[PDB]
């Protein structure tokens, strides 16, 4: 069966948003918060991204998934799947057909932001895999964590390397918070996109035919809509550079010529120098080593550890760390 718990106000998206932008555009760096790419259009923009040649990623992570999937249930040993964010469906399936391959499948628990991709999925599931208890929850990470069920033995999947577009200190604060819901006997399940040659890295996050760009500029149509904005998408360019320092990737929105630019509906008013730069995301590649290190900062030990062939990619399998003190 089916049960959906909504945790999100109507309007706690449009408020979240207003409070972003303002923020963002009133900022000494300009910048945009990552989570406003994927609006109807965004979305399935970002879709397309995962079949692009350049974008290695999502078919990395799903081919490992693939091997690995059987030995993923047999070492979690868990009857219960939750899955952090949605828009990792094919992954989905290699999981719960190992489950079910494991004779353990009872519980699915996806928890998103919205309501609908949310309750049509659970009507699919809940087809391919009758007898499955199902328990939807609409909420965020940063809030909603806690609302996720410690009913049996859990194990817990946050995939498509989304834990990457967090910097460090964010970063640590959500794989912590996240630690702290697991109970003993549960695990995560995380995948990591990994340090490459640049060249690689460079031209994943600015593909050949133009779509990530046009991604990118999405985000501009987005604040257009929402909050009465007149950006000339036409007027910025996608660029997409390498940062060595903190081994990431980084998307801008670079203004080509001179821009002023209304925010109706936040009576802002803003302006874009010409060449003046706005970061929209940052995607952080990691090292085998400080996985396991940013894991168990967090309080997690990693039980296991799975790359592709050409060590693209990782997938960590972890549980809750315990300590034994002295006095
Ligand atoms: N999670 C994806 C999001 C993205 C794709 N392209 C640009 N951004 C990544 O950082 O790889």
């Known amino acids: 069966t089916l049960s959906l718990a909504n945790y999100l106000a ?16 009133t900022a000494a760096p300009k ?16 879709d397309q991204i995962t079949r692009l040649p350049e974008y290695y990623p999502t078919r990395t992570e799903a ?24 828009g990792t469906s094919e992954k989905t399936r290699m999981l719960l057909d190992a489950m079910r391959d494991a004779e353990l499948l009872r519980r699915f628990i996806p928890f998103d932001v919205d309501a609908g991709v949310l309750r049509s999925a659970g009507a699919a599931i809940g087809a391919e895999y009758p007898g499955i208890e199902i328990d939807a929850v609409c909420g965020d990470f940063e809030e909603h964590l806690g609302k996720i069920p410690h009913v049996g033995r859990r194990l817990v999947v946050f995939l498509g390397s989304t834990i990457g577009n967090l910097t460090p200190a964010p970063r640590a604060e959500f794989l912590s918070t996240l630690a702290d819901t697991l109970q003993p ?30 991604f990118n500029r999405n985000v501009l149509a987005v604040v257009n809509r929402e909050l009465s904005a007149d950006f000339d998408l036409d007027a910025f360019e996608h660029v997409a550079k390498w940062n060595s320092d903190e081994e990431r990737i980084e998307m801008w ?34 090292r085998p080593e400080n996985v396991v290190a940013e894991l168990a900062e967090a309080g997690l030990r990693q039980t296991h ?14 549980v809750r760390l315990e300590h034994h003190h002295h006095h």
Do not use: N
């Open 185 to 214: 006997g549960d695990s995560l399940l995380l995948g990591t996109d990994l340090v490459k040659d640049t060249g690689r890295l460079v031209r994943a996050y600015d593909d050949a035919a133009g779509v990530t760009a046009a």
């Open 253 to 286: 929105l670079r203004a080509r010529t001179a821009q002023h630019v209304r925010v109706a509906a936040l009576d802002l008013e803003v302006d874009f120098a010409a060449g003046e730069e706005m970061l929209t995301e940052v995607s952080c590649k990691f």
């Open 63 to 86: 081919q490992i998934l693939r091997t690995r999937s059987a030995e993923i249930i047999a070492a979690a040993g868990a009857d219960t799947l939750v899955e952090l964010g949605s």
């Open 305 to 318: 550890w799975w790359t592709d062939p050409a060590g693209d990619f990782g997938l960590s399998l972890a």
């Open 31 to 46: 910048s945009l918060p990552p989570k406003w790419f994927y609006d109807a259009v965004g979305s399935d923009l970002f």
């Open 10 to 25: 109507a309007d706690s998206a449009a408020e979240a948003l207003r409070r972003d932008v303002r923020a963002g555009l």
